[PDB]
Amino acid sequence: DLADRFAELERRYDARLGVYVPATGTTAAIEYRADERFAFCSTFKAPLVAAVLHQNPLTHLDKLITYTSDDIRSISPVAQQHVQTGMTIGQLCDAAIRYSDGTAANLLLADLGGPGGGTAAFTGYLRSLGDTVSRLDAEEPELNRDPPGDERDTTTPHAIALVLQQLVLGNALPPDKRALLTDWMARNTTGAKRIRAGFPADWKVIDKTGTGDYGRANDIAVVWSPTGVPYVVAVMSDRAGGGYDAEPREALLAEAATCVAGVLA
């Protein structure tokens, strides 16, 4: 039984696990703690890129953004190298999704603009997609640090799955912008040990991970079966029992995804 298996994983990893897969044509929704809040961590970067894409002409991707030493405040594998040159909006989107670059995310939030350095406009974008649950309150690095249970900077597996479904499978974005987002998620470098690890090789997986304090490890994905049937998979986890420095456990997400894949096969 799936709920029993997910509970077993919680005990194995001393973790809290949330899973949602929306209903499709012939499969019921899969849900485990799906309406409980979990920190976004870096998973917000996927809808952030969608918001920036939606807000601007496509060739806004070519606008050069400059930034300085004091902008590097979080894990930023790409932006750390480009303080002198700057990065275009398209380079920032690429880095935010594929390398989970925190500075890139902060600069994209500032591009979106408005109160809270763009966090309010990001939340507004989610509201426009019918998500009345999620909220972004801080930027990097603070957004990963809220204590367990705090509602700041949270989504739920259910809410983020429905947002991702609209972005990738629905009509939230026009086809050209949709393809940009999908391709960046398809080319993600950070997700091999999470949802990808749970699905057979002949299933396509595109994803955005998140990792944070209190042992937080998330992954949001769209998967496609070998015959082109898509499913959205959101897995979120934390480990409050280990305190602030608890190790995130990718293995928990790989096991949870393996269980989901067995149901979807």
Ligand X SMILES: *C(=O)[C@@H]([C@@H]1NC(C(=O)O)=C(S[C@@H]2CN[C@H](C(=O)Nc3cccc(C(=O)O)c3)C2)[C@@H]1C)[C@@H](C)O
Say if CB 93 and CB 49 are below 8 A apart. Answer: yes
Spatial distance between the Cα atoms of 115 and 96, rounded to a whole number of angstroms: 21
Give the up-direction half-sphere exposure of residue 259: CA atoms within 13 A in the CB hemisphere.
23
Per-residue exposure over 146-181, b if at least 16 CB sit within 10 Å of its own CB, e if not: bebeeebbbbbbbbbbbbbbbbbbeebbeeebbebb
Of the two residues 62 and 247, which places its CB atom closer to ligand X in the complex?
247
Task: Find the shortest distance in angstroms from Cβ 155 to ligand X.
Answer: 13
Q: Which is nearer to ligand X, 31 or 139 (CB)?
A: 139
Distance of CA 77 to the CA centre of its chain: 17
Instruction: Give the integer Cα–Cα distance in Å for 48 and 106.
Output: 10
Residues taking part in catalysis: 42, 140
Nearest approach, Cβ of residue 143 and ligand X (Å): 7
- Write the burial class of residue 59 (CB in 10 Å: 0-12 exposed, 13-18 middle, 19+ buried): exposed
The Cα 169–Cα 165 span in angstroms is 5
210 is in an annotated binding site: yes
Strand partners, 204: 224
Ligand-binding site membership of 74 (annotated): no
> For residue 185, what are the contacts with CB-CB under 8 A and spacing of at least 6?
46, 97, 168, 206, 207, 208, 222
- Residue 90 assigned to a binding site: no
Report the residue number, 31 or 101, with the smaller CB distance to ligand X: 101
* CB closer to ligand X, 51 vs 253: 253
Q: Which is nearer to ligand X, 22 or 102 (CB)?
A: 102
Interface contacts to ligand X, rule CB under 6 A = 41-42, 74-75, 100, 102, 140, 144, 190, 209-212, 247-251
100 labeled binding residue:
yes
DSSP category for residue 190: S
Shortest separation between residue 4's beta carbon and ligand X, angstroms: 21
Looking at beta carbons, which residue is closest to ligand X? 42
Closest separation between CB of residue 104 and ligand X, Å? 9
Q: What is the DSSP letter of 134?
A: -
Question: At its nearest, how many Å lie between ligand X and the CB of residue 254?
Answer: 8
The helix (run of H) or strand (run of E) holding residue 147 is none
Binding residues for substrate: 100, 209-211
